[PDB]
Structures are given as structure tokens and as C-alpha cells.
Paper text:
Sugars and other sweet-tasting compounds are detected by the sweet taste receptor, a member of the class C GPCR family. The sweet receptor is a heterodimer composed of TAS1R2 and TAS1R3,3,4 two type 1 taste receptor family members that share the distinctive architecture of class C GPCRs: a large extracellular Venus flytrap (VFT) domain, responsible for ligand recognition; a cysteine-rich domain (CRD); and a seven-transmembrane (7TM) domain that mediates G protein coupling. To address this gap, here we present cryo-electron microscopy (cryo-EM) structures of the sweet receptor in the inactive, unliganded state, as well as in the activated, sucralose- and advantame-bound states. Unlike other class C GPCRs, such as mGluR, CaSR and GABAB receptors, where agonists stabilize inter-subunit VFT interactions to promote activation, the sweet receptor is activated by the rearrangement of a TAS1R2 VFT loop, which destabilizes interactions between the lower VFT lobes and the VFT–CRD interfaces.
We first determined the structure of the human/mouse sweet receptor in the absence of sweeteners. To improve the resolution, we combined all particles to generate a global reconstruction at 3.1 Å resolution, then performed local refinement focused on the VFT/CRD region or the 7TM domain, obtaining final resolutions of 2.9 Å and 3.6 Å, respectively. While the orientation between extracellular and transmembrane domains can vary, each domain remains nearly identical across individual classes. In our apo sweet receptor structure, the two subunits pack closely against each other at both the upper and lower lobes of the VFT domains, as well as at the 7TM domains. In the apo state, the 7TM domains of TAS1R2 and TAS1R3 interact through two interfaces, a configuration that is markedly different from that seen in other apo-state class C GPCRs.
Numbering used by the authors:
A (entry chain B): 561 to 835
B (entry chain A): 554 to 831
Write the structure that this text describes.
Amino acid sequence: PRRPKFLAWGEPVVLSLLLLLCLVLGLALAALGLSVHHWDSPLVQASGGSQFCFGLICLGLFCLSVLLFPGRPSSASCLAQQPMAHLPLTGCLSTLFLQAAETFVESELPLSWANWLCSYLRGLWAWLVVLLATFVEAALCAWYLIAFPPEVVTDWSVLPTEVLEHCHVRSWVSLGLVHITNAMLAFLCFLGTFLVQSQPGRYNRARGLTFAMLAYFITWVSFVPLLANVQVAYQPAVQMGAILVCALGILVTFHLPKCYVLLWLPKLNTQEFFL
Amino acid sequence: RQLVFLEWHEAPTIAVALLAALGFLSTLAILVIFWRHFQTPIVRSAGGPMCFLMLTLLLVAYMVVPVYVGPPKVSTCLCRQALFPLCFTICISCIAVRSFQIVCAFKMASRFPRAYSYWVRYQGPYVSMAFITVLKMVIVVIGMLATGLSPTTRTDPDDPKITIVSCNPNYRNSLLFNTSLDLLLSVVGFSFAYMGKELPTNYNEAKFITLSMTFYFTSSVSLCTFMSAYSGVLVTIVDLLVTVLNLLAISLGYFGPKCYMILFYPERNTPAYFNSMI
């Protein structure tokens, strides 16, 4: 007789990803701790102050979202899987988009427009931009959960002696409805930074932003063919891996080197070098 | 069963046609703005008549859509397979050559003149463009006349009542062997242009080459991923959308800044100013 099949808590494919989750979340919260301890210093203020902390928190939630994929499916899990990941991801990426906006405006624009426009990339209006991005993401997710909601599917035939239960996406083309906003924010962030030229004797945000978006796009380009090719039993594993590796790609590339400067090289944390 | 091919009633078909119309009209505007200012530094530094050749090729390439749409014939097979893609590759080759010239020439002259003078003399630039041109042309001819000049059809994978009509058998493989040479050219031009990001030599066009090659690279990778993960009816219009987006990525992404400066920074078109950039 047939037995059900799904990613089990304790299967090595799940444990090896939970350890990765532990590493990524620990790094994110350690970076937040260093940020809180050095809250007032130039390296934090030049990162938008509380914007830095909020981005790290959004990344932490983005990482914690993976706990919905493995285990016995349920309708709530099926509907929650994608939004619970990509909404915090928008909340994170919008802050990097603001950093890219600053670094672009202050390097590739006439000085009058630079000194005018820069005022609206700080304070209340920066939170306005973040809130707008989050609202658009939520609206497209509300569209997704009505036009293309996934379902718990029991598939008796695709395995030789087992029953597959999986959160069936109706079609991959429908899954872009939740990706598009984050992807466009990432692409704009990349274009805003990847061609900047560094002034001598000062910090260079553009390289960090550029490499972070490059890792993002590498991850999500690799994600598609893996999802297409992998055995039907392990697509949740691919989705979890993509989420965690994307979070790691951002974390190791943008926040972590600032933490390293705080720890090893505090002599650089000066008004002249960062501001 | 029922045959399927692009037609003017469809929402995505008319959307792509409108996008192509925008591209064609903008390219024509570029060409005429150039023609009036034919005697001035911004266009003379662009190589003059070569840019009009390139813009004519782009104008012709934008004419693809009315030939791409509708029930195919052998002539439309030739058009879809060879005639327009070759027009695209010709342009990309010239962009790559200019990217090489801008950044590498002075260094090579200072460091390897005894070898580089072989490229300086004879007709080095035209030689490179012609070599790449015939390479792409012969590859295209081999593929097309091997796979056939008649239309091809397949059964839809999830609504088998409809059969899909196209001109490129084994679509993913055909696109791979079509676009590999263009990817090589893209990477080479991007490398040289990025190494040239600081240089003003010809109104900073290394920066715009970098931008346009980025717009081409992302679209090419997106198309390859999509074809690696989808097989339904949409393929034969996603390919067209990507083609039009590439033609835009060139027509706007490389020429637009030049005409923008012609219109709104005419002071920089003065020879006394150009002498500070040359």
C-alpha cells in the first residue's frame, strides 16, 4: 500500500537547510547588534540610520519565512508560502534602492538637481518610498491570491509506491506576479550603482550595492531551471534554498563588510571618510 | 484541430506592434536629427555615414513585425530566420568595434605597435566587421538550410487541440545557435566599454555602450531562462518582444544620448569644447 511523501522534518535535505538558516539569521542579528551598539557613528548614519536596522530586520523575517515550505502541507501553508517571503523581501530591497538612489544622484546628476532632490531621499519621504513599494507588493500579492491561488494537490500516480502531496503552483508564468516588483527594484538598484567611479580617500557604497544585486540576480536566474529540472518531490527544497541563498548573497555582500569595518578598522569610521 | 499563429486582434500582438512602432518612429527622429547636423562634432565623432548605415539597418529591422505576424510562407521563413537577425548582428558588431577602438587603441600603440599597426593599416575596422558579418551569415545559412525553409508545427503540450506554427525547429536549440555569437560580441564589447567607463574621448559613449550592452545582456539571459522553463503558445511572441526590446536597447540606449546632447546641450557641440574631449 501507498504511503504519503513530502519533505520531512529531520530529512537531511531539510536539516542541511535549517543549519544554513541558522547561519544566515545569526549573521543578520549580529549585524543588527553591531548596528545598535554603534548607532550614532558615521558608518551607520551614512547607511540611513534606522534604515540599516529596518533592512536587517526585514532580511531576518525573509529568512524565517522558509519554515513554511517543509512538512505536511496545508491550505494555509500553500497560500502563505510566497507572500510571507516576497513581502518582507520588498521591505528589505526598497532600502537598498534608496541607497542606490543616493549614490546615483550624488555622482551622475547636475549639482543643482542633486542638492534639490537629495532632500527627498531622507527622513519622512524615504519611509514614504518604502511604504509605497510595500503597498504595491501587497496589492500584487492580493491579486495573486485571487487570480492564481495555489492548492494542496494529492498526486497518486507520479510516484511508484507513494503519494505525493505538494503545494501546486498552477503555472510558473503565474508565479512572476509576486517576483516582478522585487526584480524591478533590484534591476534599478543595480543600474544605479554598477558604473560609478570612486573618489579617492572616501567610502564607496556603490560597489557593495552592485555586488549585492548581482548575487540576487545570479540566484534567481539559477532558481528557475533548478525548479524545472528537480524531482517533483523536492521543489520545496529548491524554493527554500533559493530564499536562503539570496538572503546570504545580500547579507555577505552589503551589511557584513560594514560590520567588519566596525570590528577590525574603527579608525575608518570618521566623518571625513564616510560623510 | 486548429492552427495558431500571431494575428492583429490579440492583446500582446498589438502591444508589441505598438512598441515596435515607437521604436521605428524614434529611430527615424534620430536619423533626421543627425542628417541636419551632419557637419558637427557630435555626429562627426560618430563616424558620419557609418551611423546612417547602422540607423538604416535598425529602421529595416523594426519592420519585422508585419512580416513576423500572420500565416507564414517560405519567404517569411527566410525573413524570420535570416534577413532581420543578420541586420541586428551587423549593428552589434560595429558597436563592439567602436568599444574596442575607444579604450584600447592608445595603449596598444604605446605597448604593441609592431603588431597593432597591422590592424591600423589596411582596413582593420571594416575587416573585423566583415569577418563577424560573414561568420554570422554562414552560421545562419547552415542552420536554416539544414533545418528547412518551410514552416514547422508542433502539438501544444497542455491543450493538444491546437497546433502551433513557427519557422524555427527545435526553438531552444535554434535560438542558442543563433544568439551564441551575439553573446560573445556582447561580452567583448561590454568588457572594453567598462574598462573605458571614465574616458570622455567621444562624448563619453563608452558609458552608453556599457548601458546598452547591459540592456541586451539581461534580456538575452531572461529569454534563455524562459525558453529553458516554458514551451507553450507564448514562445513565438516572447521571442518577438525580446527582439524589439533589444532593438530599443540599441536605438534608444546608444543613439539617444547623442541627440539629447544635440538638442539640449548644443554648447558642447562647439569645436572649442570638443577640443577639450578629443
